[PDB]
Amino acid sequence: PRRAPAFPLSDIKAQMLFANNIKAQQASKRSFKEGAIETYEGLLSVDPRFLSFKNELSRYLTDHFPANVDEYGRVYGNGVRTNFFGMRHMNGFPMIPATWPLASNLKKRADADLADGPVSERDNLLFRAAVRLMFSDLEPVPLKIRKGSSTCIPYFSNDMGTKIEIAERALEKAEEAGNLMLQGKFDDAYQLHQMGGAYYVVYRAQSTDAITLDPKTGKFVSKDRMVADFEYAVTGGEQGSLFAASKDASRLKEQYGIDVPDGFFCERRRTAMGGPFALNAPIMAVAQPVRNKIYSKYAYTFHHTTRLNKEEKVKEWSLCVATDVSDHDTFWPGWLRDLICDELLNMGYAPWWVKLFETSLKLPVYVGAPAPEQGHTLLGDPSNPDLEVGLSSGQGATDLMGTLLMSITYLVMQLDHTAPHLNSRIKDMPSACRFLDSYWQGHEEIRQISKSDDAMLGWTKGRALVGGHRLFEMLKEGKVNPSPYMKISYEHGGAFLGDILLYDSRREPGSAIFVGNINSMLNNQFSPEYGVQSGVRDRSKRKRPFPGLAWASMKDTYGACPIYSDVLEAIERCWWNAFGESYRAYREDMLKRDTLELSRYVASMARQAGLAELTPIDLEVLADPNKLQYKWTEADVSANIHEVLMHGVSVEKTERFLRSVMPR
RNA sequence: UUCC
Ligand SMILES: [Mn+2]
């Protein structure tokens, strides 16, 4: 299957990915880096008192609150779905090495017995119907840009004025670039408009990962995370090795003189990709309108906000199945990319725009530093984009691509195993569209609520119900994958978008409730993914702008957890043992300081008005903008708060851009 | 130095 071409940083093809400015040049050369994160102002993640705190808190909570998950993966009782040892990592120090991204996932999919295209005409009609329902009758809106985000290849600018110019210039020259691409002139498109080149691979921390305590040895064991070396990555797995990264932290003592307590490990690192902003801008200009459409018209299956918002839907079901998808982004099929482009062309979308979109899902990737003495290599040839990495995280519409794939995959699962009587409803495009439009509004006996690779599938009373139970049973047995498209299983400890579905003795959706995940509160408060970046003066540009504000939304977010009170008290007690101070007081102080500092960023609130007008979501997002990247959408945040985190491009300009893209 |  052809190895992918690879070029060292020194090669002209890689050099061309970095503009002649210090930032870009430094991004190209950055070597492996690690170090303790500043968990909170003045507190490092490896501070002896903090690790002592984590040791005691994790053992105590695990021992006193064992998981309550039944044989079908439904959590009940204490609402706990696992041990609490996940907090035992030296945050800021990664597992070595991180993985090289797979240049082609075709073999990976084939070996996993996944299909290389819609397996039946019905499936082909549904995937295409999804494209028609999602990309039709879109309303333009201004292109919003995250403050402080990098434009990556080739400029690596973080300056909002520069980003706005890049975005406006891109919406203006997109057509010309796309047509150049239609002519096979990728180098031209890239050199003239910076549309193309590659994704810049950045390795991010998944701060908490599974750890178990071996009753026999009394030693802790970290979950092995398999990583691919360069050979494996460029040959799509045909050669090279797939092996377990080392999470052993002993090295930190010898290397940095850091004391490492027993049972503390290095963090799991995941690949993330920064897209070339000039190419992403014209894609984002279409993506937001699509989100606005599916979150409004198809709100039932796609717009999720609070625990109660989700609860109201699942309540009406007779059966709720919490699914789980294995490695969604790397398994995502390039044929769906081509199917989507093809259908957009049929709907009348501008060819040059579709070309831009298709190319963004075939782009080469530049690998920075997976480990010491490794990296700085471009995978793929920018002159002719042909990678099959699956779904690139920094592409302008990754969320939509995952949602489109999975939503139809789940529907097909329901049709295949429970509702054959609904197949006659899907005879052609018009009927497929009508059926999908109704299914997505929650009007059929089979339903779902989903977002990318997270979802809950439902069956009301009816003919499909009996099949629903058979499907659930098949998932429990876990011997046969219920889908030809992705590896699907049931989630151990069913949850949807952060909220655990707590069942009572009846184990039925009608008497079940969504509660926050208490473990996530712990991950967020004691294992953040980033330090506080106290050296970045503009807080709005930090990964964690106002960390202290989360204390004010805690009760609203986790109050419904059965053991909420208990955890807060175990924390207070353990923090006292470790620091000789009150954690609560410590947090109230951080809350006060950040509340005072927030007024400096929000025109709305007076030079000291409280948080009175802000919602729980507003607060969680100010403390962790990332949640606006996987949990909520712009519309869920008060407008004056959204302005703090994002800046937009003129409405007139995106409006003019959209008009030229969409169907006449 | 990404992406509702
Ligand atoms: Mn789930």
XYZ file of C-alpha atoms (C1' of nucleotides) and ligand atoms in Angstrom:
669
model
C 0.000 0.000 0.000
C 2.893 2.440 -0.589
C 4.788 3.956 2.345
C 4.093 7.644 2.787
C 6.873 10.048 1.662
C 8.719 11.608 4.618
C 11.025 14.609 4.638
C 13.394 15.889 7.332
C 13.025 19.455 8.555
C 16.134 20.334 6.506
C 14.357 19.475 3.217
C 12.890 22.326 1.205
C 9.424 20.753 1.456
C 9.501 21.064 5.263
C 11.282 24.457 5.293
C 8.505 25.918 3.155
C 6.062 25.096 5.999
C 7.638 27.737 8.226
C 7.694 31.429 7.389
C 10.763 33.602 7.910
C 9.846 34.723 11.437
C 11.180 33.629 14.838
C 7.933 32.072 15.986
C 7.559 29.871 12.924
C 11.231 28.899 12.918
C 11.079 28.014 16.609
C 7.922 25.946 16.105
C 9.722 24.004 13.386
C 12.702 23.225 15.636
C 11.160 22.913 19.091
C 12.676 19.920 20.830
C 11.044 17.602 23.353
C 10.041 19.524 26.479
C 8.654 18.543 29.883
C 8.350 19.995 33.398
C 5.935 20.396 36.300
C 2.879 22.465 35.451
C 1.964 25.322 37.739
C -1.304 23.648 38.819
C -2.480 26.877 40.574
C -0.516 30.098 41.178
C 2.478 29.153 43.264
C 1.721 25.411 43.332
C 3.606 22.913 41.136
C 2.056 19.563 40.267
C 5.005 17.730 41.821
C 4.982 19.723 45.072
C 5.581 17.077 47.835
C 2.584 18.263 49.837
C 0.343 18.034 46.742
C 1.451 14.539 45.766
C 0.992 13.471 49.418
C -2.498 14.931 49.226
C -3.227 13.020 45.990
C -1.904 9.788 47.453
C -4.092 9.972 50.510
C -7.211 11.253 48.744
C -7.065 8.691 45.956
C -6.661 5.685 48.274
C -9.323 6.895 50.685
C -11.975 7.576 48.045
C -11.285 4.332 46.214
C -11.496 2.331 49.405
C -14.635 4.017 50.692
C -16.481 4.503 47.392
C -15.973 1.435 45.160
C -17.551 1.608 41.718
C -21.253 0.822 41.335
C -21.669 -0.428 37.756
C -23.778 -3.437 36.869
C -23.093 -6.254 34.361
C -24.680 -4.076 31.655
C -22.460 -1.107 32.431
C -25.179 0.974 34.065
C -24.030 2.877 37.110
C -26.277 2.997 40.159
C -25.811 3.742 43.839
C -22.880 5.987 44.685
C -22.605 7.072 41.037
C -18.962 6.055 40.908
C -17.800 4.134 37.871
C -14.176 3.482 38.715
C -11.374 3.843 41.225
C -9.917 7.331 41.860
C -6.270 6.505 41.118
C -6.406 8.416 37.843
C -5.129 11.496 39.674
C -1.807 9.797 40.331
C 0.246 11.431 37.550
C 3.188 13.835 37.611
C 1.334 16.431 35.483
C 3.609 18.028 32.923
C 5.796 14.946 32.443
C 4.719 12.729 29.503
C 4.962 9.062 28.690
C 7.912 8.367 26.371
C 7.605 8.246 23.410
C 4.317 9.707 22.189
C 2.990 8.147 19.007
C 3.869 8.997 15.443
C 0.590 9.608 13.643
C -0.460 6.936 11.149
C -0.070 8.282 7.587
C -2.720 5.852 6.334
C -5.470 4.126 8.276
C -6.714 1.926 5.394
C -4.968 -1.181 6.687
C -5.962 -0.330 10.229
C -9.633 -0.281 9.188
C -9.371 -3.420 7.041
C -7.645 -5.374 9.785
C -10.357 -4.294 12.209
C -12.934 -5.647 9.753
C -14.438 -2.228 9.076
C -15.962 -1.425 5.667
C -14.210 0.581 2.965
C -17.474 2.208 1.828
C -21.264 2.235 2.543
C -22.053 -1.470 2.557
C -25.568 -1.120 1.126
C -27.457 1.397 -0.956
C -29.602 2.227 2.081
C -26.519 3.249 4.059
C -25.267 5.224 1.075
C -28.583 7.133 0.980
C -28.535 7.874 4.725
C -24.914 9.180 4.775
C -25.758 11.412 1.789
C -29.097 12.425 3.363
C -27.098 13.584 6.383
C -25.069 15.802 4.079
C -28.248 17.260 2.612
C -29.928 17.947 5.934
C -26.755 19.404 7.468
C -25.494 21.675 4.669
C -28.720 23.090 3.262
C -30.386 26.435 3.976
C -27.528 27.742 6.094
C -27.548 31.240 7.595
C -24.277 33.193 7.499
C -22.717 34.377 10.750
C -19.409 35.990 11.491
C -16.328 33.771 11.658
C -15.258 33.643 15.320
C -11.636 33.186 16.331
C -10.295 31.990 19.716
C -8.085 34.700 21.243
C -4.462 33.655 21.616
C -4.760 30.663 19.283
C -1.936 30.115 16.782
C -2.471 30.300 13.024
C 0.103 27.486 12.806
C 1.515 26.818 9.291
C 3.199 28.869 7.983
C 3.110 32.011 10.232
C 2.439 30.724 13.745
C 1.038 34.103 14.681
C -0.982 34.519 17.886
C -1.830 38.142 17.208
C -5.557 38.713 16.844
C -5.106 41.560 14.359
C -2.904 39.303 12.228
C -5.380 36.432 12.531
C -8.286 38.595 11.417
C -6.316 39.785 8.351
C -5.308 36.206 7.537
C -8.946 35.103 7.857
C -10.384 37.947 5.770
C -7.691 37.535 3.103
C -8.434 33.802 3.066
C -12.203 34.264 2.562
C -11.325 36.586 -0.285
C -8.846 34.311 -2.033
C -10.400 30.929 -1.214
C -12.075 30.594 -4.605
C -8.851 31.278 -6.432
C -6.957 28.812 -4.247
C -9.571 26.101 -4.616
C -9.590 26.386 -8.365
C -5.803 26.172 -8.378
C -6.192 22.958 -6.397
C -8.786 21.685 -8.875
C -5.992 22.102 -11.450
C -3.577 20.055 -9.388
C -1.596 23.190 -8.523
C -1.284 22.656 -4.751
C 2.124 24.291 -4.436
C 0.712 27.352 -6.173
C -2.323 27.503 -3.879
C -0.010 27.213 -0.855
C 2.643 29.713 -1.977
C 0.069 32.330 -2.997
C -2.571 31.920 -0.274
C -1.068 29.651 2.356
C -3.855 27.134 1.797
C -2.214 23.732 2.045
C 1.160 22.687 3.438
C 0.505 20.532 6.517
C -1.042 20.144 9.933
C 1.385 20.946 12.756
C 1.384 18.039 15.229
C 1.226 19.108 18.880
C 1.245 16.559 21.703
C -1.275 17.198 24.467
C -1.705 15.757 27.931
C -4.614 13.537 28.904
C -3.801 14.373 32.546
C -5.603 11.424 34.056
C -5.563 7.871 32.705
C -6.389 4.526 34.310
C -4.274 3.141 37.117
C -5.147 0.092 39.219
C -3.824 -1.211 42.510
C -2.769 -4.894 42.381
C -4.213 -6.477 45.547
C -1.552 -9.179 45.375
C 1.578 -6.986 45.163
C 0.132 -3.786 46.593
C 1.830 -2.047 43.659
C 0.042 0.346 41.298
C -0.152 -0.432 37.570
C -0.634 2.227 34.868
C -2.669 1.422 31.739
C -0.396 0.645 28.830
C -0.868 3.030 25.936
C 0.343 1.648 22.602
C 2.336 3.975 20.358
C 3.551 3.594 16.778
C 7.146 4.338 15.793
C 8.016 6.110 12.553
C 8.197 2.980 10.419
C 4.781 1.810 11.568
C 3.303 5.277 10.947
C 4.566 5.765 7.405
C 3.751 2.201 6.298
C 0.285 2.275 7.828
C 1.277 -0.539 10.157
C 2.759 -2.877 7.542
C 6.221 -2.500 9.069
C 7.689 -1.003 12.231
C 6.380 -1.464 15.767
C 3.283 -0.767 17.817
C 4.405 -0.847 21.471
C 3.557 0.390 24.963
C 4.884 3.846 25.804
C 6.690 4.027 29.132
C 4.763 5.836 31.871
C 7.464 5.039 34.479
C 8.283 8.206 36.449
C 11.306 6.961 38.390
C 13.430 8.775 35.828
C 12.308 12.136 37.193
C 14.352 11.664 40.376
C 17.525 10.817 38.504
C 16.874 13.452 35.802
C 15.513 16.429 37.711
C 15.939 15.630 41.374
C 12.180 15.318 41.809
C 10.966 12.916 44.491
C 8.569 10.383 42.988
C 6.098 8.720 45.376
C 5.193 5.111 44.785
C 2.335 4.718 42.347
C 2.719 8.046 40.483
C 3.239 7.982 36.697
C 4.017 10.071 33.657
C 1.003 11.315 31.692
C -0.653 9.822 28.681
C 0.000 12.044 25.679
C -2.241 12.340 22.674
C -1.589 13.793 19.255
C -3.426 16.959 18.325
C -3.114 18.868 15.072
C -2.963 22.562 14.354
C -4.376 23.393 10.974
C -2.972 25.903 8.502
C -5.278 28.791 9.356
C -5.671 30.225 5.844
C -7.096 26.833 4.778
C -9.259 26.382 7.889
C -10.843 29.866 7.800
C -13.010 29.234 4.724
C -14.017 25.894 6.218
C -14.920 27.379 9.600
C -17.008 30.004 7.786
C -19.318 27.168 6.664
C -19.002 24.962 9.733
C -20.515 27.360 12.251
C -23.629 27.866 10.107
C -23.964 24.054 9.942
C -23.724 23.829 13.740
C -26.370 26.501 14.129
C -28.651 24.511 11.880
C -28.243 21.111 13.514
C -28.359 22.590 17.043
C -31.616 24.362 16.249
C -33.641 22.215 13.822
C -32.176 18.925 15.019
C -31.730 19.987 18.594
C -33.253 16.748 19.847
C -30.405 14.534 18.836
C -27.640 17.188 18.670
C -28.048 20.077 21.166
C -27.061 19.091 24.697
C -26.666 21.492 27.564
C -27.546 20.500 31.124
C -28.118 17.216 32.923
C -31.838 17.976 32.898
C -31.732 18.821 29.176
C -30.461 15.296 28.481
C -32.625 13.738 31.189
C -35.877 14.932 29.642
C -35.207 12.934 26.504
C -33.796 9.719 27.938
C -36.677 9.725 30.460
C -39.211 9.019 27.715
C -37.310 5.959 26.467
C -38.006 2.351 27.430
C -34.433 1.406 26.653
C -31.287 3.497 26.702
C -28.019 2.119 25.342
C -24.768 3.973 26.136
C -22.356 3.265 23.322
C -18.601 3.530 23.096
C -16.464 3.984 19.957
C -12.849 2.831 19.826
C -10.215 5.364 18.660
C -12.696 7.419 16.633
C -10.337 9.913 14.980
C -7.749 7.456 13.725
C -10.473 5.040 12.442
C -12.531 7.793 10.722
C -12.890 6.756 7.038
C -11.505 8.756 4.194
C -14.251 7.340 2.013
C -16.771 9.305 4.075
C -14.718 12.414 3.244
C -15.105 11.603 -0.469
C -18.755 10.687 -0.097
C -19.419 14.025 1.631
C -17.588 16.051 -1.002
C -19.383 14.204 -3.786
C -22.822 14.920 -2.257
C -21.955 18.602 -1.647
C -21.025 18.861 -5.307
C -24.458 17.352 -6.159
C -26.238 19.884 -3.928
C -24.548 22.665 -5.853
C -21.769 23.717 -3.481
C -18.969 25.633 -5.242
C -16.412 23.108 -6.548
C -13.462 25.201 -5.436
C -14.806 25.229 -1.872
C -15.444 21.472 -1.862
C -11.917 21.066 -3.160
C -10.566 23.113 -0.247
C -12.580 20.927 2.135
C -11.460 17.659 0.591
C -7.811 18.724 0.666
C -8.046 19.653 4.387
C -8.840 15.982 5.035
C -5.850 14.688 3.032
C -3.110 17.001 4.249
C 0.421 15.994 5.219
C 1.377 16.295 8.872
C 4.552 17.738 10.372
C 5.743 15.838 13.410
C 7.398 17.938 16.077
C 8.829 16.114 19.060
C 7.299 12.743 20.181
C 10.347 12.194 22.350
C 13.906 13.327 22.989
C 16.045 13.138 19.836
C 13.026 12.303 17.659
C 10.740 14.117 15.265
C 11.026 17.176 13.060
C 9.745 15.223 10.103
C 7.094 16.000 7.516
C 4.878 12.968 6.598
C 3.265 13.225 3.161
C 3.945 15.456 0.160
C 2.307 18.925 0.198
C 2.561 19.040 -3.615
C -0.101 16.306 -3.715
C -2.160 15.796 -0.531
C -3.003 12.102 -0.222
C -2.760 11.061 3.429
C -5.449 9.014 5.176
C -4.804 9.895 8.833
C -8.482 9.646 9.654
C -9.856 12.834 11.211
C -7.358 15.667 11.835
C -8.286 17.513 15.048
C -7.372 20.973 13.749
C -9.508 20.696 10.597
C -12.211 23.391 10.549
C -15.096 20.925 11.011
C -13.809 17.880 12.879
C -16.785 17.918 15.221
C -19.264 17.813 12.339
C -17.320 15.037 10.561
C -17.419 12.874 13.668
C -21.041 13.641 14.344
C -22.097 12.883 10.725
C -20.203 9.593 10.720
C -21.416 8.353 14.100
C -25.034 9.564 13.979
C -25.631 7.545 10.778
C -23.567 4.615 12.135
C -25.811 4.442 15.201
C -28.989 4.731 13.111
C -27.773 1.920 10.862
C -27.071 -0.149 13.973
C -30.688 0.398 15.069
C -32.095 -0.437 11.606
C -29.900 -3.532 11.170
C -30.586 -5.121 14.560
C -33.975 -3.786 15.670
C -36.047 -1.997 13.034
C -36.082 -3.842 9.673
C -39.671 -2.689 9.384
C -38.375 0.849 8.884
C -36.205 0.021 5.862
C -39.089 0.503 3.417
C -39.142 4.120 4.557
C -35.778 4.646 2.798
C -36.193 4.102 -0.950
C -34.310 7.017 -2.486
C -32.804 10.405 -1.612
C -36.122 12.223 -1.022
C -37.454 9.463 1.242
C -34.067 9.033 2.971
C -34.048 12.750 3.723
C -37.628 12.700 5.030
C -36.923 9.717 7.246
C -33.662 11.149 8.616
C -35.255 14.547 9.193
C -37.903 12.848 11.324
C -35.480 10.534 13.110
C -33.181 13.425 13.967
C -36.082 15.401 15.484
C -36.776 12.444 17.755
C -40.091 11.623 16.073
C -39.487 7.910 15.415
C -39.641 4.900 17.748
C -35.869 4.604 17.567
C -33.913 7.673 18.780
C -30.508 8.969 19.811
C -28.710 11.838 21.406
C -25.142 12.173 20.223
C -21.988 14.180 19.683
C -19.033 12.742 17.842
C -18.142 9.472 19.554
C -20.408 9.813 22.537
C -24.025 8.842 22.390
C -27.022 7.163 23.901
C -29.393 5.208 21.728
C -33.065 4.868 22.599
C -36.117 2.720 21.905
C -39.615 3.778 22.896
C -42.439 1.243 23.087
C -42.977 -0.513 19.770
C -41.807 -3.134 17.319
C -38.127 -2.178 17.578
C -37.980 -2.471 21.374
C -37.535 -6.234 21.487
C -34.665 -5.872 19.005
C -33.200 -3.100 21.133
C -32.828 -5.542 24.014
C -31.231 -8.107 21.733
C -28.723 -5.504 20.554
C -27.924 -4.513 24.145
C -27.418 -8.187 24.957
C -25.091 -8.582 21.979
C -23.050 -5.586 23.179
C -22.849 -7.081 26.678
C -21.544 -10.339 25.265
C -19.057 -8.304 23.304
C -18.130 -11.016 20.830
C -19.519 -9.355 17.719
C -19.159 -5.789 16.521
C -22.720 -4.547 15.785
C -21.482 -2.226 13.070
C -19.600 -2.543 9.799
C -18.273 1.046 10.081
C -16.566 1.548 13.479
C -15.710 -0.632 16.490
C -18.731 -0.153 18.775
C -19.183 -1.536 22.276
C -21.142 -0.463 25.330
C -19.661 2.109 27.767
C -18.697 0.652 31.148
C -20.533 3.126 33.311
C -22.859 4.760 30.796
C -22.437 8.514 30.477
C -23.194 11.221 27.935
C -21.141 14.416 27.619
C -19.784 14.331 31.155
C -23.007 13.323 32.903
C -23.449 9.821 34.298
C -26.873 8.227 33.814
C -27.659 7.055 37.355
C -30.199 4.198 37.364
C -32.185 3.003 40.367
C -33.196 -0.563 41.281
C -35.583 -0.789 38.331
C -32.700 -0.141 35.948
C -34.990 1.692 33.504
C -34.558 5.061 31.710
C -37.853 6.363 33.053
C -36.627 6.270 36.646
C -32.989 7.150 35.937
C -31.276 10.513 36.314
C -28.235 12.262 34.905
C -25.705 13.356 37.528
C -22.320 15.024 37.142
C -19.270 12.774 37.175
C -17.584 13.367 40.538
C -14.324 11.972 39.151
C -14.298 14.697 36.486
C -14.548 17.311 39.243
C -11.412 15.750 40.703
C -9.665 15.591 37.314
C -10.465 19.305 36.728
C -9.460 20.573 40.175
C -6.351 18.503 40.790
C -5.157 17.402 37.384
C -5.605 20.271 34.928
C -4.207 19.738 31.464
C -2.342 23.063 31.514
C -0.574 25.205 34.072
C -2.033 28.606 34.996
C 0.386 30.403 32.624
C 0.780 33.264 35.121
C 3.324 34.875 32.789
C 0.706 35.513 30.052
C -0.652 38.954 31.061
C -3.770 38.754 28.915
C -5.825 36.176 30.797
C -8.267 35.785 27.921
C -5.388 34.261 25.953
C -4.536 31.589 28.614
C -5.692 27.955 28.382
C -7.220 28.498 31.871
C -8.269 32.204 32.006
C -9.985 32.310 35.402
C -9.378 29.015 37.277
C -10.999 30.251 40.503
C -14.417 30.760 38.932
C -15.063 27.015 38.737
C -15.597 26.981 42.500
C -18.772 29.008 42.014
C -20.249 26.549 39.515
C -19.148 23.362 41.305
C -22.403 22.788 43.245
C -24.461 23.281 40.124
C -22.244 20.975 38.093
C -21.595 18.180 40.611
C -24.159 18.731 43.334
C -26.359 15.892 42.106
C -23.623 13.315 42.519
C -24.589 10.917 45.331
C -21.218 11.265 47.061
C -20.656 14.976 46.402
C -20.617 16.025 50.092
C -18.357 13.129 50.925
C -15.743 14.000 48.345
C -15.639 17.673 49.379
C -15.099 16.604 52.965
C -12.461 13.998 52.115
C -10.708 16.789 50.165
C -10.970 19.240 53.071
C -9.619 16.603 55.442
C -6.756 15.474 53.168
C -5.778 18.968 52.174
C -5.519 19.832 55.840
C -3.218 16.853 56.411
C -1.026 17.886 53.477
C -1.008 21.695 53.659
C -2.292 22.567 57.112
C -4.871 24.886 55.502
C -8.532 24.789 54.519
C -9.051 23.862 50.874
C -12.435 25.540 50.908
C -10.975 28.827 52.136
C -8.126 28.504 49.650
C -10.722 28.170 46.852
C -12.909 30.983 48.117
C -9.886 33.248 47.965
C -9.028 32.164 44.413
C -12.737 32.698 43.556
C -12.620 36.266 44.928
C -9.402 37.192 43.107
C -10.541 35.817 39.762
C -13.987 37.380 40.150
C -12.279 40.770 40.641
C -9.969 40.181 37.704
C -12.853 39.106 35.399
C -14.465 42.574 35.607
C -11.357 43.906 33.879
C -12.274 41.829 30.829
C -16.040 42.219 30.726
C -17.442 45.601 29.759
C -20.805 44.349 31.122
C -20.101 43.890 34.835
C -19.083 47.071 36.626
C -15.521 47.496 37.844
C -16.471 45.058 40.618
C -19.994 43.775 40.057
C -20.226 40.191 41.254
C -20.857 37.045 39.221
C -24.615 37.501 39.718
C -25.481 37.524 36.026
C -23.188 34.651 34.967
C -24.463 31.091 34.499
C -22.840 27.840 35.674
C -21.785 27.210 32.035
C -20.317 30.707 31.779
C -18.139 29.926 34.791
C -16.979 26.440 33.741
C -15.992 27.874 30.373
C -14.099 30.890 31.805
C -12.142 28.425 33.911
C -11.728 25.988 30.994
C -12.366 27.299 27.445
C -11.609 23.786 26.260
C -15.097 22.742 27.313
C -16.333 25.053 24.573
C -14.443 22.663 22.315
C -16.072 19.368 23.220
C -18.932 20.006 25.635
C -20.765 23.214 24.751
C -21.170 25.528 21.793
C -21.049 29.312 21.475
C -24.785 29.580 21.875
C -24.640 28.095 25.368
C -22.510 30.948 26.694
C -23.752 34.411 27.673
C -22.826 36.767 24.814
C -20.734 39.184 26.882
C -18.699 36.222 28.169
C -18.202 34.666 24.732
C -16.712 37.998 23.627
C -14.052 37.526 26.310
C -12.765 34.363 24.684
C -13.372 35.014 20.989
C -13.156 37.735 18.400
C -15.006 37.791 15.106
C -14.463 38.669 11.467
C -16.950 41.130 9.851
C -20.421 39.747 9.198
C -20.480 41.468 5.801
C -17.394 39.615 4.714
C -18.432 36.123 5.757
C -21.867 36.808 4.357
C -20.352 37.645 0.993
C -18.143 34.543 1.274
C -20.998 32.165 2.101
C -23.127 33.482 -0.712
C -20.431 32.464 -3.203
C -20.048 29.029 -1.627
C -23.556 27.742 -1.100
C -26.042 26.468 -3.707
C -27.429 29.158 -5.998
C 1.940 26.990 19.770
C -4.813 23.520 16.793
C -10.640 22.615 16.231
C -18.563 24.857 18.599
Mn -20.882 7.907 26.706
